[PDB]
Design a protein around this nucleic acid. Sequence first.
DNA 1: CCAGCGGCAGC
DNA 2: GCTGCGCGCTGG
Length: 138
Amino acid sequence: KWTPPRSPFNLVQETLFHDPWKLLIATIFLNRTSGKMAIPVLWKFLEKYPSAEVARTADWRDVSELLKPLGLYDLRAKTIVKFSDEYLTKQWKYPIELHGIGKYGNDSYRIFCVNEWKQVHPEDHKLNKYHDWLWENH
DNA sequence: CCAGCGGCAGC
DNA sequence: GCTGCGCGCTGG
C-alpha cells in the first residue's frame, strides 16, 4: 500500500522507491548509460548531494566533474540542478512535468512510487522485464 | 587493438 | 521528427 516487490531482475528502482527524488535521479544516471557504470557513480553522487535541497544549490560544473566517466556530463549536470529545483518548487502530480524526466522516469515513478503499474506501458527493456513479471505474478 | 551501444530536451 | 550530447563497455 504501495510497496513494489523485490524482483529477480534487481532494478535499482526497487531500492530507491521510498525517496522519489533519488529514484528519479537514478533514472537520469541511466540515460544512454549502462547501469554497471552508472550505479557506482550514483552512490558517489548521493553521498555528496543527499537531497533535492542540496542539489538545486550546486554549481553544475562541479556536478559535471563527478559525471565525467559516464559521458553526457555537462548535459546531465545542468539537468540534475534544474530538475531538483523543479521537484521542490514546482507543483507536479507526475514527474514527467519536471525538466529532465521523460517517459522512462515517469513510467518508473508510476510503477514504484505510486500504485499505477497496471496503467503503465514501458518501452525500456528492464522496466518491461519487471512490469511483465508483475502481471504474471498478479 | 575496433565500432556499435547503453533518454531527454530544444528546436 | 531530428539532432546534440559522450563516456567506457562490449563482442569478436
